[PDB]
Amino acid sequence: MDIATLIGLIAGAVAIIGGFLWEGGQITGLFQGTAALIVFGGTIAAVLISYPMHRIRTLPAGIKLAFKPNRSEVNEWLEDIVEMSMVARREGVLALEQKVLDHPNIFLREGIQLVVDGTDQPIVRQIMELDIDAKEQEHDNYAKLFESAGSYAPTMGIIGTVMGLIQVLGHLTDPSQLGPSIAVAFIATLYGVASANLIFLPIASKIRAKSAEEILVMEMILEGVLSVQNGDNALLVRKKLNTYIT
Amino acid sequence: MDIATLIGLIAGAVAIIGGFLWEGGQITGLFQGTAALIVFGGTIAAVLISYPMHRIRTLPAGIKLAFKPNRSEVNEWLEDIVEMSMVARREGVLALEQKVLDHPNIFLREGIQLVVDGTDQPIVRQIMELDIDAKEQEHDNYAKLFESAGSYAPTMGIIGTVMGLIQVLGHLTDPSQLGPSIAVAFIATLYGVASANLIFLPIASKIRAKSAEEILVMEMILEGVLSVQNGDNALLVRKKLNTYIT
Amino acid sequence: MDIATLIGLIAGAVAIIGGFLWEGGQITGLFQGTAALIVFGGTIAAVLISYPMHRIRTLPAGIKLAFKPNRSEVNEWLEDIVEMSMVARREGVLALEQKVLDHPNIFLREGIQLVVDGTDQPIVRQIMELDIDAKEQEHDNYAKLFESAGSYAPTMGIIGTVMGLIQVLGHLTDPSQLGPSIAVAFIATLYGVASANLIFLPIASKIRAKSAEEILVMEMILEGVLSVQNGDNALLVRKKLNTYIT
Amino acid sequence: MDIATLIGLIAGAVAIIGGFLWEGGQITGLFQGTAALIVFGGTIAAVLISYPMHRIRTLPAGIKLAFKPNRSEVNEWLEDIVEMSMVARREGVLALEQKVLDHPNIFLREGIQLVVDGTDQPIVRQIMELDIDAKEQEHDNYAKLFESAGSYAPTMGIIGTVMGLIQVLGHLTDPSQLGPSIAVAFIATLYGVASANLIFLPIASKIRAKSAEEILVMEMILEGVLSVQNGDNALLVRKKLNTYIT
Amino acid sequence: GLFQGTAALIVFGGTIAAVLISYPMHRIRTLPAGIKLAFKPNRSEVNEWLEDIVEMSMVARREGVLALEQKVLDHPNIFLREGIQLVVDGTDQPIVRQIMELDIDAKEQEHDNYAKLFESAGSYAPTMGIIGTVMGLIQVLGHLTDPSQLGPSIAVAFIATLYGVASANLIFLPIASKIRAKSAEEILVMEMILEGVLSVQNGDNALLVRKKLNTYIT
Amino acid sequence: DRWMITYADLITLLLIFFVMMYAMSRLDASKYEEVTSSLQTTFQS
Amino acid sequence: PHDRWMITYADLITLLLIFFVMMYAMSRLDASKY
Numbered sequence A, B, C, D: 001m002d003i004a005t006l007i008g009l010i011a012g013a014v015a016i017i018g019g020f021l022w023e024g025g026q027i028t029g030l031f032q033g034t035a036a037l038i039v040f041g042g043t044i045a046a047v048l049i050s051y052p053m054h055r056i057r058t059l060p061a062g063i064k065l066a067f068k069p070n071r072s073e074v075n076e077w078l079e080d081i082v083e084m085s086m087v088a089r090r091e092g093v094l095a096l097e098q099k100v101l102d103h104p105n106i107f108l109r110e111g112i113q114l115v116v117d118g119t120d121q122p123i124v125r126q127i128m129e130l131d132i133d134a135k136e137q138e139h140d141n142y143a144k145l146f147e148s149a150g151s152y153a154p155t156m157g158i159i160g161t162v163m164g165l166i167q168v169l170g171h172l173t174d175p176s177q178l179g180p181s182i183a184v185a186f187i188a189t190l191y192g193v194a195s196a197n198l199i200f201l202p203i204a205s206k207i208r209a210k211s212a213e214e215i216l217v218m219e220m221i222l223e224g225v226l227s228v229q230n231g232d233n234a235l236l237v238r239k240k241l242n243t244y245i246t
Numbered sequence E: 001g002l003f004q005g006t007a008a009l010i011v012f013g014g015t016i017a018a019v020l021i022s023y024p025m026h027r028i029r030t031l032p033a034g035i036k037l038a039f040k041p042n043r044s045e046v047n048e049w050l051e052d053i054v055e056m057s058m059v060a061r062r063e064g065v066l067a068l069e070q071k072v073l074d075h076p077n078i079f080l081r082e083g084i085q086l087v088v089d090g091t092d093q094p095i096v097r098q099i100m101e102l103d104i105d106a107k108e109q110e111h112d113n114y115a116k117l118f119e120s121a122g123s124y125a126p127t128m129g130i131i132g133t134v135m136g137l138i139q140v141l142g143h144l145t146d147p148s149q150l151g152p153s154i155a156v157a158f159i160a161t162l163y164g165v166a167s168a169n170l171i172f173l174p175i176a177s178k179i180r181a182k183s184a185e186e187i188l189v190m191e192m193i194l195e196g197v198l199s200v201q202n203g204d205n206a207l208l209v210r211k212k213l214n215t216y217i218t
Numbered sequence F: 001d002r003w004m005i006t007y008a009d010l011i012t013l014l015l016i017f018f019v020m021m022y023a024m025s026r027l028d029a030s031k032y033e034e035v036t037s038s039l040q041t042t043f044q045s
Numbered sequence G: 001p002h003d004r005w006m007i008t009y010a011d012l013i014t015l016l017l018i019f020f021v022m023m024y025a026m027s028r029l030d031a032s033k034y
């Protein structure tokens, strides 16, 4: 897991549970079976109706993009593109093929393959930008599942509470327990709001943050391959690519 | 009709009804005549007032799009367009005309007809894009009916609470009348939120998801036809069109 | 510290605290520990889950931009560009290399270096604009942390309230002393809405305002460097650059 | 004070106060010290935190633009440029200097000076357009202060309402002191909504209307100056420039 | 629940006040014409009298347009009549398009300005409804002696909210929408006249004028 | 979205109303009049 | 969304209102039988 998510979950549990215990309570009074089944079951139902089945199989991959550690290999590639620049300058474009064959980055490998095949500069720009646009769209689709789960969850909490209160309207005759009865009913709304705000919308926001980092790295590889095709000098190549790395 | 919707409806029914029955409800307790008539009758009335009658006939077509099974044909059309591009490199354009004369995809057929007629490349783009935006507008109009039904249904819940509040302020002669009167407030609220959130807004969301898939197939066919007009070699065509598929 | 922020915080405290006290409440009624822990602890948790760790370390820098005293040096630079331009015209471009070595503005220094190295005008514009775009993106990322904190804080106020109502309605056996109990629950909503609106969304707004001012200084050094390359007469350069300054 | 604003304020006061007095009331009721301090104090705090101090000094100048009378001289200049067009025809462009030697409009005076110096058409266009963009940006910044105050003012009202609900629940145990506290809720709503939608959000709209009138006058002086450089015959100039006047 | 006097004087009075503060008086005096365009006959005749313009295409080039100026004295429309005077000797292709094209932009801006008054009125009116309701509830806070009025008195206060929401949605936003939609139709008729004037310079093919003009008609 | 921030405010006003109506109903005629009159002074004349 | 809190707040307030409007109604009814 990401260290920020681990510390965030620790802080979140201490805030909510510690707050409840400080005003006075038991944690066993904050757990309900039926409220969990209505809120989570209802959210899951609304998401499954909302999306085709193939999207839901992407949901596993969505969490892997969010919680993955930051490998941060961008710097390594910035060097390589600079080095390819120097090879292209002395040796000619055929040497770029032999340099690139076994590079662990596919997008870079394909970009260089288009330049060694001698394609004209607007065409290599067009094909590589279509790959970037496809990755932008893919990551947005993962995030949208979690954003939509976060918008149904609070309303499912309301359905939960109103179902609780309908049962209580059958026991209004006993005034002593009406009060404790209403409290148990409210538990569902606490789940609806709390799950949306802590779990669902944070996972969506973290997906969108990590997508933006990865798209920058792709755009650098795009300016890198167009720069080596233009035949810029190594100092100018380094200066352009440096604008991307933070 | 469709698998993700079917599992969603099963999960939704089990969550809401199972939650109520686990804490000792009876299913007849959720049904109320006047609450049903205000929320469902009022939603139907609001849609019929707000939209011209021909739009309501599109509602059948909207559901037909939403629960259309997954179609694999994009792979086949990629192969077709690559084969056609290979013929365009080797052969006279007349071979395209005779090959595509009886092709099942109308949009692709018309694009090729325009390239055989030798029509100007920006005009070919323009007329194809006018058909794409016409199809996008048709699907958006279906979705908007369901989004409006999702807005009206909660407001009919508010009207239900107002009717409940009027009865309880107006008329009591013994406290027993309390429960049978305030019942209308709660049950109308439940139908408003539950119908909007599970039925209406999911069907809207699924229409928009399926529309986006169909528009991507049209965009791929457009880029295929423009590649054939430019005269690109088959391997490069294969790469571009493949970016659209995932 | 910045004087408009300081007077704004004094006015904010007087509005909320003075507004409460003037009708005969108490600071001891207003200041609630458990409500503070659930709203602030919950906001911190949601932001930590929402962002990677490296972005949270940018928070220090974000506040430093928001409260930067505006000791404007923009006017000082306009002189530097104008005098540099007339040196370039009379002496030849080599003189700029001797002159612009100690200069504290790195963006201007690199602009001049690109012109000295004889690079083409569209390339100079491209590289300089990439550095402007990088700084615009950096300042947007700072603002987004505060905008997201301001979104979560009100919802944490709802969690603190509903948890408060769970405790009170739970230990109620009859309708006595309920009013004071329920009142304290609403204090958590008050901290959520009041902190978001005065502290969080203003600091977001101020970061975006001061970003825009800094980008205009860079855009001027862009027209300064391009006019130095063109070799316009000093009066014309002074005219253009003045359009940027207020 | 423009005539429209004076009649608008008279209509506003007569509608609201006349409505209240007619149905029965006393005007001393609609002043609530605490409500004023929450709504106006809070709005002042939020705006001061949001903007650097130099912007707030511009706020006076924003009102001066909103309420200046329409002593439009656009018609005067539509003659001036056309004249100068004739003088350029039957005399050298050098003569233009004496005709524009002194003019109330700086924009016109300078524009012609750049044509007298003999500067090229795309550069004279660019310098003139930079002055227009600077004027548009200045007027937008005035409007933004008023729009922002209009945004915070209703949200300060809801903070005041929550403070009202807290205080009224506090007095349930001894219901004998709720007279003042009951109002602070209602009157804080009234100040929030009324100030936003009668004072702030209008004055924003008037600033944007009057900026658009001034920008159109500058766009005319630009088209006039370029026509004077081109040396068009007077009838063509008069036709074009007139299209700007309404 | 009819014409509550106080509600009307607070929803309509307040909407009028907000609009008068919002716009300079010269804009407010254009309200008359805004209504005229919003409620006016279909008047698609020009679209069908395109044949009148196309009659000109062959005839204008068939013999000298020297009689054309007197010939087009009749007003098919001013833009058309004015355009012919320019299309007469004295205009290069770019300039004649530019002067005529500018007229089109000026008319588009004029119609948008009418619509914006109604859009803004429909934005202030619903909020003023709220001001009316809150003043109603304040007046009920005064007279709290009786226990039956606690019902009807709250109901009448809410009538002020309805007069807002209802006025905004039915009166104001439809008048805005119908102004802007018919402006877009009238702009197309302009574009028709522009293609007529450009084709009058370009040649003398009656059927060819038909082809170009037909594209603009839809 | 102005409606939400208003329909939130307006609904809160109604709750404040009834919280007051409930509390007064738990009081006798004497203290009822003092409060009922006291208010009746500021918002009528 | 910025204003996502108001959706839940308007739901909670509404439930609270129903509770007092139900109590108020009971208080009058009890006072009538007393």
Ligand SMILES: CCCCCCCCCCC(CCCCCCCCCC)(CO[C@@H]1O[C@H](CO)[C@@H](O[C@H]2O[C@H](CO)[C@@H](O)[C@H](O)[C@H]2O)[C@H](O)[C@@H]1O)CO[C@@H]1O[C@H](CO)[C@@H](O[C@H]2O[C@H](CO)[C@@H](O)[C@H](O)[C@H]2O)[C@H](O)[C@H]1O
Residues within 6 Å of the ligand: A165, A168, A169, A172, A173, A174, A175, A178, A179, A182, B175, B176, C169, C174, C175, F026, G018, G019, G020, G022, G023, G026, G030
């Ligand atoms: C945040 C909201 C949650 C709060 C919790 C909810 C309610 C909290 C308690 C309020 C409340 C129940 C609610 C009733 C409807 C509201 C339902 C709301 C829930 C909706 C989902 C209980 O309140 C009771 O009544 C009085 C209220 O103060 C009070 O009377 C005393 O103290 C006074 C002090 O000034 C003082 O004058 C004096 O010493 C007493 O007069 C009692 O001590 C108190 O126990 C209302 O009271 C009602 O009293 C009725 C007569 O008993 C009772 O009628 C039923 O039972 C009768 C004999 O059993 C039987 O003869 C009736 O035939 C039967 O019909 C009602 O059922 C109800 O109980």
